[PDB]
Write a protein that binds this DNA or RNA. Structure first.
Length: 64
DNA sequence: GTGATCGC
DNA sequence: GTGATCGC
């Protein structure tokens, strides 16, 4: 519902957090995948520092 | 290296 | 099997 903005292979992306498929923590990094067009899966990551709460709670609720 | 994945 | 990616 809210969005996450992140920079991936140069330049900024903004994705609806409803598209996020999987999220995991790597120390202070919040890493994820997300659904795109064409049946493809995108990757992105953000600092925990100001990560959207919607995304952080997904982390705490899944199941890897 | 780290966690996980894409895209070879 | 693995190189690049992401924040650190």
């Amino acid at each position: 519902m809210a969005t996450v903005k992140f920079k991936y292979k140069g330049e900024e992306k903004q994705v609806d957090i409803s598209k996020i498929k999987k999220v995991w923590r790597v120390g202070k990094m919040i890493s994820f995948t997300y659904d795109e067009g064409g049946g493809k899966t995108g990757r992105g990551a953000v600092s925990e520092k100001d990560a959207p709460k919607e995304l952080l709670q997904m982390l705490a609720k899944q199941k890897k």
